[PDB]
Write an enzyme that holds these catalytic residues in place. Sequence first.
Site: not given
Lengths: 428, 334, 437, 54
Positions: C11, C15, C99, C143, C254
């Site tokens: 999520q 988002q 999950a 999460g 870099e």
Amino acid sequence: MREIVHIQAGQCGNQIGAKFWEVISDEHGIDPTGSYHGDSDLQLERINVYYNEATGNKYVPRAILVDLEPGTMDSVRSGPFGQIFRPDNFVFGQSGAGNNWAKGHYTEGAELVDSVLDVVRKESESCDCLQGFQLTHSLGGGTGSGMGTLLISKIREEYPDRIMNTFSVMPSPKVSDTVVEPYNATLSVHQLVENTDETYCIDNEALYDICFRTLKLTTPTYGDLNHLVSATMSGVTTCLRFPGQLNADLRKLAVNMVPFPRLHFFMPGFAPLTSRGSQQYRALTVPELTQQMFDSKNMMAACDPRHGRYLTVAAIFRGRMSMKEVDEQMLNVQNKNSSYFVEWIPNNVKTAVCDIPPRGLKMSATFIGNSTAIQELFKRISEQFTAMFRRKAFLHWYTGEGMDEMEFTEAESNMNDLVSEYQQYQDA
Amino acid sequence: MYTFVVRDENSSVYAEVSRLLLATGQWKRLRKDNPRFNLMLGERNRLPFGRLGHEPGLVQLVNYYRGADKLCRKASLVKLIKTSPELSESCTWFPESYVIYPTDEREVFLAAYNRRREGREGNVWIALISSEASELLDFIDEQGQVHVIQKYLEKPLLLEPGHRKFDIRSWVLVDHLYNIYLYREGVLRTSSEPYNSANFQDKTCHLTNHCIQKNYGRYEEGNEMFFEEFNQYLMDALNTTLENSILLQIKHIIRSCLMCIEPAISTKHLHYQSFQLFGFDFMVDEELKVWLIEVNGAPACAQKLYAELCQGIVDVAISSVFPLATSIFIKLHH
Amino acid sequence: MRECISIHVGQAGVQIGNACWELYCLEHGIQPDGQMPSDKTIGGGDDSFNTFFSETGAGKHVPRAVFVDLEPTVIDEVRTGTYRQLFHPEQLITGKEDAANNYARGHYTIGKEIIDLVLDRIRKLADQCTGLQGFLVFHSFGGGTGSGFTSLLMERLSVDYGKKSKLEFSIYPAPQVSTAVVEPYNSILTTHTTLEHSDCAFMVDNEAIYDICRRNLDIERPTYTNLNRLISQIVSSITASLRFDGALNVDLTEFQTNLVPYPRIHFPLATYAPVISAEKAYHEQLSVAEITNACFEPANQMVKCDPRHGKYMACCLLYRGDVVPKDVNAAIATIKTKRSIQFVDWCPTGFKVGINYQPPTVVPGGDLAKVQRAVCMLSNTTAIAEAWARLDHKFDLMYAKRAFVHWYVGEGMEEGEFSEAREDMAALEKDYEEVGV
Amino acid sequence: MEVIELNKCTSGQSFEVILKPPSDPSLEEIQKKLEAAEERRKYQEAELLKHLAE
Ligand SMILES: Nc1nc2c(ncn2[C@@H]2O[C@H](COP(=O)(O)OP(=O)(O)OP(=O)(O)O)[C@@H](O)[C@H]2O)c(=O)[nH]1
Ligand SMILES: Nc1ncnc2c1ncn2[C@@H]1O[C@H](COP(=O)(O)OP(=O)(O)CP(=O)(O)O)[C@@H](O)[C@H]1O
Ligand SMILES: Nc1nc2c(ncn2[C@@H]2O[C@H](COP(=O)(O)OP(=O)(O)O)[C@@H](O)[C@H]2O)c(=O)[nH]1
Ligand SMILES: [Ca+2]
Ligand SMILES: [Mg+2]
Ligand SMILES: [Mg+2]
């Protein structure tokens, strides 16, 4: 994951179950036909959790109705929302269970259970992604208790990776049908401890006291008790039914609420406490909701929260209100009373807000607590069990169905283990 | 009801502060490890400053300034005075000092020792007190850790009757706004045995520590001369006040030390807030020149004054942040 | 020109991804349909923006982006959202069940059955790269997918693309907006498993952003939308040098070179200024001195901690808007004499400065006011270990009673992985100690 | 004090200012971990189903 399959078993199970479907159907805009007639889109967004769509477009509860007697199911069918249930999801025998756990679990229930599992399978197969199961039953009778826990065992065998949850009504001498209720409750708890993930303890003692002391009803009926149950039930399932961040499915609720697998018996709380019909006109302030929802007198399990410690808490605020004021008040409760929240689970209080209030209230709060004070509930049942069991009183009802005394001894010991396991964490 | 935790058992100052907080009944004490406090009275060592000010809905406050050890260890104080433009080597109220290691500025130390040897002018130093250089360095490698070599003050002011050495302890409270508050009561910690210019081996007439004395108790109760008496004395003997001859210098030193570290330690724009009580130790020479000896990060008070100062701590450091339902301090104006 | 693939996991990753790509489109004048009028080479090019956007013959500019979630709701929003046309369906990958806030479920159980598909859809983007330099990975620590799936994905990316650089943007957990009591567990497990596979990781503490939104934007109760528009502004500051012509941080290599001398200690602090509410009626525009000074305030940091009590290993200033070197050096000189800035002995005391003349773009009707100049400071300071100290204490408190561990064991993880992950964190906390005093 | 590495273009500029000078697991091993865990889940499940068979 989306779909939950609902099972209601026995007289109590089917009476609270019918009220639940009545209350949540009105919240989702569904009428007795199964026809949606609501305004908001929040109403339909997660309707698939509890409802099947069959072209119409009609909504059918994912609900299986189970009894060993036909009585209470005929009551449901000619009740208010009676037409909504799928007629094939009505599974009944004729002979009843006579308030006898052994009949529900071993003899009469064994005869009926395969037909129930056929209906469970048929419902489970239409699911994109079944979350699991909720069961409504009491622990004091024979069908909801004995057959209900038989069903749970068989459901777990066939779906071992799904979540199993129960709304379990605990018996009390204050509101009592038979003397054997403590026997039936002890045998059922033994099952629940091993085969559910999460169990809401609805204490008939507490519901009685709330009705008597707080709602000023001098003689509570089952109807009055069930009004509190259906409000609590609507409240605890809010995060499952409506768009929302946390405790949004059955597994995530279990993961946040259950730190050790056996300690999964929750005390629900509700505010404001209202009686049936008689309306309250003054909405509650966010500080008032927050104080009442945590008050022992708003708890649906007759345990004193100050006699234990909270392992975890989920709080659901319903209505249009200030989310900033909610966070502040929620934070205020914890900071004021920090010694009651275990310090070895950080941030163990989670809060959700939903815009849709329940029917007839502008603001409401629902409390779900995993407290070590729940042990008081099990100690009480244990005391009642031993008073009889030490003289082996009433046991012939059970040995007559094939049970040995050993099974009682084991069920008692396991319930005493659960008690002392709660005491372990109350002192850690 | 405000909340607080206690993580230093050996602190007489803070024992008394909590005792006072409880006695208002508007403060509740929690267990050591409950994070849901408003106030931490913390441990002396390894205080978890990183875990402060991350509790939503709680204004948090601690009774130590992170980084104040730069002022409060002898090695660090020397380094801080030498390298800061505000203080510099030019600094005139701090004794000439060098930092010395065993396995560093040993080289630069022996160089200034020889210019003293040039004109044979008073060449005595402290660490413990010797006349000759290489007898100090041989004491250093014998001990283990790092220590400082400091010019010893050979011409101290001596109280009569009794030819006695002393030091002044001043108590300073720095609040969460970085107001610097000098407790109006100080204390002199006196020697009982007469001062011995030609024998630095006799050690209790040279070191004024309240423990090392217990001749003890002869002239004043517990080798403690307070302010009213020492002022009376300075008027009677030397025709001057405590204010003019000593305290102006003390106020100057305190404000200089603490203004210097303010950018490094201030909690003005931080997620948690700090205060601290310091004990500044001063020596006075025979011309009434004040020298800073050391700064103590966790001082004890003097028996007679526990009540008054601990009350002040509550009044200006605690209740200022957490108000309940004249002053004993001089504010030093920066 | 060398391409970068962005990977958005769970999520939070998705988002935040949406907000970043939204912003990228506005900055490069790429429209919702995927068309870019100012681009004159139709169907191709090796301009600086093509690092992030590939092209079709029809002239559609398409993010070199893969979105992965274990549950469909959040990616379904992207699929039917205002930027629906921008992304190819094969770039949006969803499972059926998530999950459940459980590292072990994201890594072992559900990870196993989706990892090959994800790596195959990544390969489809890699095949269209003439010279792929590597990966930008967006996820939460807290999460189950963000932590568990990410760490597995990182292990496999090291295997299939061993030469390539991997950068992380990681949401560190905060109780004010967090969804799970086990986030501390998930965080430590994912950090342990990911540590070796990541070249440079930017931690964003939700607490710090939450408070910036409260204090500076006057938002009473910040949502994910508020937080993400702010986060995407900081991310765009960081990636601008890959997407625009310039000579600082022009490739992923870099970033390590300039910000990470010691490989384990790869977590630079970001500080951003200024943040100004769009409904602040009267705003006096801040100068180069003032915005640079603000880079040294804890209140403006992506992680609340105290850089005065650690040591610096590197420091980059990334300006957007009307800024010239002269005013930078003048601002630095003054700041140097007022602040505690301490570098480690084995590093030069100094700043690498990059200026892009285009002022930050803001999302129309968003919360942020247009400003004439802004700066992002990236500093590798030991002070950021305060955030590991906090996380480790919370982990220790729960694990000492083995609270919730059975959820992880039940997913096939061994209890020993907890104590192993925690040991690596104790060693990490130690490394920062040795470098830092 | 010292300004170095100054690079200018149409889009902006970069430079460095110095104030003071100084003083993996294989594909096989992964497959192994994920299959070990799967076997632990298979065994826990088979233990549960045996107990339910009893
Ligand atoms: N800043 C920010 N944080 C987020 C957002 N969404 C979730 N989080 C944070 O991420 C953590 C929860 O992780 P999610 O990314 O929601 O979890 P997930 O990766 O989808 O994993 P599962 O749902 O467990 O499968 C919490 O700390 C949240 O506060 C977001 O849009 N912005
Ligand atoms: N440079 C100097 N010249 C003269 N006398 C000195 C001196 N340095 C120290 N002393 C004396 O020796 C004593 C040593 O105490 P010092 O303050 O150096 O360390 P300390 O920690 O043992 C005492 P405290 O607990 O107050 O900090 C002082 O009380 C003072 O009388
Ligand atoms: N709260 C509540 N309790 C009930 C209701 N009906 C019965 N009970 C309780 O449930 C127990 C008896 O079980 P019951 O469900 O009637 O028997 P069953 O049909 O064999 O499961 C006793 O503890 C009763 O007090 C009800 O409608 N509400
Ligand atoms: Ca082109
Ligand atoms: Mg009945
Ligand atoms: Mg998710």
